[PDB]
Each structure stands twice: as structure tokens, then as C-alpha cells.
Design a protein around this motif. Structure first.
Motif, PDB file in Angstrom:
ATOM      1  N   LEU A 121       6.079  -2.563  -1.107  1.00 12.37           N
ATOM      2  CA  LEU A 121       6.111  -2.355  -2.551  1.00 12.37           C
ATOM      3  C   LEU A 121       6.490  -0.923  -2.835  1.00 12.37           C
ATOM      4  O   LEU A 121       7.126  -0.614  -3.838  1.00 12.37           O
ATOM      5  CB  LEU A 121       4.755  -2.714  -3.181  1.00 12.37           C
ATOM      6  CG  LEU A 121       4.472  -4.152  -3.638  1.00 12.37           C
ATOM      7  CD1 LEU A 121       4.978  -5.228  -2.694  1.00 12.37           C
ATOM      8  CD2 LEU A 121       2.994  -4.378  -3.909  1.00 12.37           C
ATOM      9  N   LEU A 122       6.120  -0.029  -1.926  1.00 16.58           N
ATOM     10  CA  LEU A 122       6.152   1.378  -2.224  1.00 16.58           C
ATOM     11  C   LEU A 122       6.476   2.173  -0.958  1.00 16.58           C
ATOM     12  O   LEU A 122       5.574   2.668  -0.287  1.00 16.58           O
ATOM     13  CB  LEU A 122       4.773   1.776  -2.776  1.00 16.58           C
ATOM     14  CG  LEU A 122       4.605   3.137  -3.424  1.00 16.58           C
ATOM     15  CD1 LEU A 122       5.483   3.214  -4.662  1.00 16.58           C
ATOM     16  CD2 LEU A 122       3.139   3.332  -3.785  1.00 16.58           C
ATOM     17  N   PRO A 123       7.768   2.291  -0.614  1.00 15.00           N
ATOM     18  CA  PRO A 123       8.125   3.004   0.612  1.00 15.00           C
ATOM     19  C   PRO A 123       7.700   4.480   0.652  1.00 15.00           C
ATOM     20  O   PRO A 123       7.244   4.942   1.697  1.00 15.00           O
ATOM     21  CB  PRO A 123       9.656   2.863   0.677  1.00 15.00           C
ATOM     22  CG  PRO A 123      10.080   2.435  -0.691  1.00 15.00           C
ATOM     23  CD  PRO A 123       8.935   1.618  -1.212  1.00 15.00           C
ATOM     24  N   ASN A 124       7.862   5.214  -0.451  1.00  9.28           N
ATOM     25  CA  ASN A 124       7.365   6.589  -0.525  1.00  9.28           C
ATOM     26  C   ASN A 124       6.222   6.712  -1.525  1.00  9.28           C
ATOM     27  O   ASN A 124       6.459   6.692  -2.724  1.00  9.28           O
ATOM     28  CB  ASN A 124       8.480   7.560  -0.883  1.00  9.28           C
ATOM     29  CG  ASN A 124       9.485   7.698   0.230  1.00  9.28           C
ATOM     30  OD1 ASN A 124      10.519   7.045   0.210  1.00  9.28           O
ATOM     31  ND2 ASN A 124       9.165   8.514   1.235  1.00  9.28           N
ATOM     32  N   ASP A 136       3.036   2.736 -12.320  1.00  5.15           N
ATOM     33  CA  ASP A 136       2.414   1.471 -12.698  1.00  5.15           C
ATOM     34  C   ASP A 136       3.286   0.711 -13.702  1.00  5.15           C
ATOM     35  O   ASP A 136       3.415  -0.507 -13.608  1.00  5.15           O
ATOM     36  CB  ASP A 136       0.999   1.663 -13.271  1.00  5.15           C
ATOM     37  CG  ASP A 136       0.331   0.345 -13.608  1.00  5.15           C
ATOM     38  OD1 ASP A 136       0.052  -0.478 -12.700  1.00  5.15           O
ATOM     39  OD2 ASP A 136       0.088   0.100 -14.805  1.00  5.15           O
ATOM     40  N   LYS A 137       3.862   1.436 -14.657  1.00  5.79           N
ATOM     41  CA  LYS A 137       4.787   0.821 -15.621  1.00  5.79           C
ATOM     42  C   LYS A 137       5.931   0.109 -14.863  1.00  5.79           C
ATOM     43  O   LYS A 137       6.208  -1.070 -15.116  1.00  5.79           O
ATOM     44  CB  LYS A 137       5.309   1.862 -16.614  1.00  5.79           C
ATOM     45  CG  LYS A 137       6.165   1.279 -17.744  1.00  5.79           C
ATOM     46  CD  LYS A 137       7.069   2.356 -18.337  1.00  5.79           C
ATOM     47  CE  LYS A 137       6.530   2.929 -19.641  1.00  5.79           C
ATOM     48  NZ  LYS A 137       7.135   2.220 -20.805  1.00  5.79           N
ATOM     49  N   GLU A 138       6.527   0.805 -13.891  1.00  2.00           N
ATOM     50  CA  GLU A 138       7.616   0.264 -13.068  1.00  2.00           C
ATOM     51  C   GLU A 138       7.194  -0.989 -12.302  1.00  2.00           C
ATOM     52  O   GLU A 138       7.906  -1.995 -12.298  1.00  2.00           O
ATOM     53  CB  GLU A 138       8.170   1.368 -12.144  1.00  2.00           C
ATOM     54  CG  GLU A 138       9.216   0.948 -11.112  1.00  2.00           C
ATOM     55  CD  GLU A 138       9.167   1.799  -9.832  1.00  2.00           C
ATOM     56  OE1 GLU A 138       9.157   3.056  -9.933  1.00  2.00           O
ATOM     57  OE2 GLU A 138       9.127   1.209  -8.718  1.00  2.00           O
ATOM     58  N   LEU A 139       6.014  -0.955 -11.681  1.00  2.00           N
ATOM     59  CA  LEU A 139       5.493  -2.109 -10.929  1.00  2.00           C
ATOM     60  C   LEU A 139       5.006  -3.282 -11.790  1.00  2.00           C
ATOM     61  O   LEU A 139       5.084  -4.452 -11.376  1.00  2.00           O
ATOM     62  CB  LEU A 139       4.385  -1.652  -9.978  1.00  2.00           C
ATOM     63  CG  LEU A 139       4.882  -0.853  -8.768  1.00  2.00           C
ATOM     64  CD1 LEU A 139       3.732  -0.026  -8.202  1.00  2.00           C
ATOM     65  CD2 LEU A 139       5.455  -1.784  -7.705  1.00  2.00           C
ATOM     66  N   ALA A 223       0.070  -1.945  -5.171  1.00  3.66           N
ATOM     67  CA  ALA A 223       0.794  -1.134  -4.194  1.00  3.66           C
ATOM     68  C   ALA A 223      -0.108  -0.153  -3.437  1.00  3.66           C
ATOM     69  O   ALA A 223       0.280   0.347  -2.363  1.00  3.66           O
ATOM     70  CB  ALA A 223       1.906  -0.360  -4.866  1.00  3.66           C
ATOM     71  N   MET A 224      -1.283   0.161  -3.996  1.00  2.00           N
ATOM     72  CA  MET A 224      -2.147   1.203  -3.385  1.00  2.00           C
ATOM     73  C   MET A 224      -3.620   0.885  -3.568  1.00  2.00           C
ATOM     74  O   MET A 224      -4.001   0.194  -4.517  1.00  2.00           O
ATOM     75  CB  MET A 224      -1.881   2.561  -4.032  1.00  2.00           C
ATOM     76  CG  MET A 224      -0.498   3.157  -3.775  1.00  2.00           C
ATOM     77  SD  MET A 224      -0.285   4.725  -4.601  1.00  2.00           S
ATOM     78  CE  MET A 224      -0.194   4.222  -6.328  1.00  2.00           C
ATOM     79  N   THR A 225      -4.450   1.377  -2.644  1.00  2.78           N
ATOM     80  CA  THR A 225      -5.898   1.326  -2.824  1.00  2.78           C
ATOM     81  C   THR A 225      -6.444   2.602  -2.201  1.00  2.78           C
ATOM     82  O   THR A 225      -5.687   3.385  -1.602  1.00  2.78           O
ATOM     83  CB  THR A 225      -6.540   0.020  -2.266  1.00  2.78           C
ATOM     84  OG1 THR A 225      -7.942  -0.011  -2.567  1.00  2.78           O
ATOM     85  CG2 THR A 225      -6.366  -0.161  -0.716  1.00  2.78           C
ATOM     86  N   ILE A 226      -7.741   2.839  -2.380  1.00  2.00           N
ATOM     87  CA  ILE A 226      -8.382   3.997  -1.793  1.00  2.00           C
ATOM     88  C   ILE A 226      -9.550   3.402  -1.043  1.00  2.00           C
ATOM     89  O   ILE A 226     -10.365   2.649  -1.608  1.00  2.00           O
ATOM     90  CB  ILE A 226      -8.844   4.999  -2.870  1.00  2.00           C
ATOM     91  CG1 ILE A 226      -7.639   5.699  -3.502  1.00  2.00           C
ATOM     92  CG2 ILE A 226      -9.808   6.038  -2.265  1.00  2.00           C
ATOM     93  CD1 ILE A 226      -7.989   6.543  -4.734  1.00  2.00           C
ATOM     94  N   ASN A 227      -9.614   3.694   0.256  1.00  2.96           N
ATOM     95  CA  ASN A 227     -10.651   3.137   1.082  1.00  2.96           C
ATOM     96  C   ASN A 227     -10.785   3.883   2.410  1.00  2.96           C
ATOM     97  O   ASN A 227     -10.002   4.783   2.714  1.00  2.96           O
ATOM     98  CB  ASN A 227     -10.384   1.648   1.325  1.00  2.96           C
ATOM     99  CG  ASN A 227     -11.631   0.826   1.225  1.00  2.96           C
ATOM    100  OD1 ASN A 227     -12.714   1.263   1.648  1.00  2.96           O
ATOM    101  ND2 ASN A 227     -11.500  -0.380   0.700  1.00  2.96           N
TER     102      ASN A 227
END
Ligand SMILES: OC[C@H]1O[C@H](O[C@H]2[C@H](O)[C@@H](O)[C@@H](O)O[C@@H]2CO)[C@H](O)[C@@H](O)[C@@H]1O
Length: 420
Positions: A121-124, A136-139, A223-227
Motif C-alpha cells: 500500500l505504501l512503498p515509502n 489518508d485522503k489519498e488512501l 497502510a500503517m500501525t504502531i506496535n
């Protein structure tokens, strides 16, 4: 009420308790002593309740921040590793489990939060928190979201709160100042304000908890989480292509996660202290033992040097250490529990819109700074005010204490009342 000749161990439900049970099995194979691993809910709250009555597990696992409070309450045995054993672990991990000059637990592993991202979803991944709304708007235009993480536990929001200047207790000359709390300063407000704006602009949902964020990430919806490192096993089995990286910066400053050292303490009331020591030193804290646990749910950067070296080349661990270096190892002081309770309420109330950021953090600052006064008076009331209605009214009043003067004024009424 703790049984002799067996070991009961409590560990959090997000850790490798099945791998830990394998270490228990090797202990059984060798000694014939049964090892039972349990993972009760809210174990860090349950332990001090039960162990104060002389009950609970023989061994408790938690991050080192809770342990000074347990030691202060006399719930933990001092541990007695000799110099040869101590030398096998990183010296700073022993510091994390030293309280009033005594070692009060065995350190196991260093944990720090990282940014986990879906490479498809998110290469960089974003280097900054500020770029996340636009992402987030883009996704959302592809039916995805940029970021989901647990908003119910302040541990996950703390790195953003701390980034621009939030802190728990000020460290001044070898000691934490329990009067100097940093949860409502300008930096803390800026970070929490950023998070609450993400929620107001519908880039995140206030109701997101651990399970919801994990499911969304593992199913490829966000595309992302924090864990932490414990989360990586589930992402592996999910076949999301993921990376683990440095947390985003905020106002150009690194996010500063509070770093925990997973630690194992021995219940002061255990009749099995020597068995506990033998299990921990000779079975768990060895290459073999840590590997079993790590294979179940990753530990992070383990405290045992030989095995840490073997794992260190993993870039997920390299990112864990990079995030740990930018954050701070938690205090283990007894005031940590009230700090965490106070911040949990602030984050929940600010994110739900129940309170403004400024009001939520001002109340948290007060709760954290006045917690000692409040505990003292609640204990005094319980011991000295026999009329239950009068006692409940005093308990209500304790909830209103803002400062030392309020504490003294109320203490005077409680003393006056008990002496009537
Ligand atoms: O959220 C406050 C909470 O943060 C830390 O708990 C962490 C723990 O260190 C990790 O091992 C993992 O289990 O996630 C927990 C957060 O849900 C502190 O260790 C804890 O005392 C505090 O209440």
C-alpha cells in the motif's frame, strides 16, 4: 495460599506464553516440578490485589515500570543472581529492575514501539506525522486508511505526546522529581492536539482498540500501525508484506516511545523462590529458553547478550533499537501507575471529545502530581473513620484534591473527625 513444589507464572496475553510453556516443559522433564503459565486479564492490576493477601503467581512478567510499585508494597522478593550470571545480560537492563539499590526482577528483553507499514500500500512510509492527513485522503480514495493503532492504551499515543516536550516525571540529579510532571506542558498539548485533529478530520476513530487496529492491519485495510515486537508473528502468518521502521517525526522532532524492559519478578509470598530462580536463571535466560519464547511471539532486543547478538541483524530489531534510542527507558518508581491511569483518561476523553485537550491534560497533570496525597488520605480514612457514610463523603472529597494545600485542609478534617 500459594502452593509449594510447583510454579505458577503470569505473563501478558500478547506475549509468547505458549513458547514460555515449552520452557516449562523442559523444566518438568528435568526436575518433575509442574510449571503452569497463565495469562489473566488486567494482570498488572490483579497482581498487587492478590499478592497483598499473600496470594497470586510465583513469578510475574511485565514491563519494568510496574515493579517499583510492587517492591514498595513489599510484594516482590529481592533476587540474588551472582556476578557470573549478571555479566551475561546488558548492564542497563539490570538498572531497569533496580529499586532502592536492590534488584527486584530478572530483565528479559527491551521493547520499543515502531511504525509498521504495508509495503504494497505504501512503498515509502511517511517520515513525519504532519504528512499523514494528506496520505489518508489519498488512501481513502482507494478504500483504505493511512493509520490505525490502539487509542485505548496511552502507551501507544505517548511517543507523539513526548515528541515535542511531554514527559512523565522530570529527572534531576540521579532521581525523578515526583512533583514535576510534564503531561500538560506545551509539547504534550501539541502532540495530543495533533492526534485529536486526526480524529476530528476522520483520519482515525476514537473507538480503535488493540484488536481492531491489529485486524485492520493484518487484513490489508490500513497502510500503517504502531506496535511492538510481539505483534510481528501475527503479521507473518497474515502474509501482508510489511516493514518495521522509525516512528514519524512531529514538529521535526523524533517520536519518543517509553521503552519497557520485559521483566520477571518473584512473589514475596512464594514458598518456591529457589525453584523460581532456577527456572529463570537456568532455563529461561539461556539461548534455548529465549528462542522458544521468541519463536512464539518476538521479544524485541533480548537482555541476554549471546542471543541478542544472534538476532541483531534482523532489520525489524534494528528498527526497534533505533526507536528505543530516540525514546526513554521508563521510570520504575511507584508513581508510574497513577501517571499511566491519569494519561489513559486524558487520551480517552480528549479523543472522544468528552473534554478538550487542555482540560483533559490539566486534569491528568493534577491526578499524577497529587496521587500520593490522595492515596495517603484514602488509607487514613479507611483506618480511622468507622461511620461508612462519613467515610464515603471523605472519599468523594479526596477526589477533589488539586495540590498540597487541599491535602492539608482535608487531612485536618479527617483527623478532627476521627478524634470526636
Ligand atoms: O498503556 C499504559 C501501559 O503501557 C505499558 O504497557 C505496555 C507493555 O509495556 C507492553 O509490554 C505491551 O503489553 O503493551 C502494554 C500497553 O498496552 C506499561 O508497561 C504499563 O505499566 C502501562 O499501564
Amino acid at each position: 495460599k500459594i502452593e509449594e513444589g510447583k510454579l505458577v507464572i503470569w505473563i501478558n496475553g500478547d506475549k509468547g506464553y505458549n513458547g514460555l510453556a515449552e520452557v516449562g516443559k523442559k523444566f518438568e522433564k528435568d526436575t518433575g516440578i509442574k510449571v503452569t503459565v497463565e495469562h489473566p486479564d488486567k494482570l498488572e492490576e490483579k497482581f498487587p490485589q492478590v499478592a497483598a493477601t499473600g496470594d497470586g503467581p510465583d513469578i510475574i512478567f511485565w514491563a519494568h515500570d510496574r515493579f517499583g510499585g510492587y517492591a514498595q508494597s513489599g510484594l516482590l522478593a529481592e533476587i540474588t543472581p551472582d556476578k557470573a550470571f549478571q555479566d551475561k545480560l546488558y548492564p542497563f537492563t539490570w538498572d531497569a529492575v533496580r529499586y532502592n539499590g536492590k534488584l527486584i526482577a530478572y530483565p528479559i528483553a527491551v521493547e520499543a514501539l515502531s511504525l509498521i507499514y504495508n509495503k504494497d500500500l505504501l512503498p515509502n512510509p511517511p517520515k513525519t506525522w504532519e504528512e499523514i492527513p494528506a496520505l489518508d485522503k489519498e488512501l481513502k480514495a482507494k478504500g483504505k486508511s493511512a493509520l490505525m493503532f490502539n487509542l485505548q492504551e496511552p502507551y501507544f499515543t505517548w511517543p507523539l505526546i513526548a515528541a515535542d516536550g511531554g514527559y512523565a516525571f522530570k529527572y534531576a540529579a540521579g532521581k525523578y522529581d515526583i512533583k514535576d510532571v510534564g503531561v500538560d506542558n506545551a509539547g504534550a498539548k501539541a502532540g495530543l492536539t495533533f492526534l485529536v485533529d486526526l480524529i476530528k478530520n476522520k483520519h482515525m476513530n476514537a473507538d480503535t482498540d488493540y484488536s481492531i487496529a491489529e485486524a485492520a492491519f493484518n487484513k490489508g485495510e490500513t497502510a500503517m500501525t504502531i506496535n511492538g515486537p510481539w505483534a510481528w508473528s501475527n503479521i507473518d502468518t497474515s502474509k501482508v508484506n510489511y516493514g518495521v521502521t522509525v516512528l514519524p517525526t512531529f514538529k521535526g522532532q523524533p517520536s519518543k516511545p517509553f521503552v519497557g524492559v520485559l521483566s520477571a519478578g518473584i512473589n514475596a509470598a512464594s514458598p518456591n523462590k529457589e525453584l523460581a530462580k532456577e527456572f529463570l536463571e537456568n532455563y529461561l535466560l539461556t539461548d534455548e529458553g529465549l528462542e522458544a519464547v521468541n519463536k512464539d511471539k518476538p521479544l524485541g532486543a533480548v537482555a541476554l547478550k549471546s542471543y541478542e547478538e544472534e538476532l541483531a541483524k534482523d532489520p525489524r530489531i534494528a528498527a526497534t533499537m533505533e526507536n528505543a534510542q530516540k525514546g526513554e527507558i521508563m521510570p520504575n518508581i511507584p508513581q508510574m501507575s497513577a501517571f499511566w491511569y491519569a494519561v489513559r483518561t486524558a487520551v480517552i476523553n480528549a479523543a472522544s471529545g468528552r473534554q478538550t485537550v487542555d482540560a483533559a491534560l490539566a486534569a491528568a497533570q493534577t491526578n499524577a502530581a497529587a496521587s500520593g496525597y490522595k492515596m495517603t488520605l484514602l488509607a487514613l480514612i479507611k483506618e480511622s473513620i468507622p461511620n461508612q457514610a462519613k467515610r464515603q463523603k471523605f472519599e468523594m472529597q479526596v477526589g477533589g484534591i488539586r495540590n498540597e494545600q487541599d491535602f492539608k485542609n482535608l487531612r485536618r478534617e479527617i483527623i478532627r473527625s476521627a478524634a470526636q
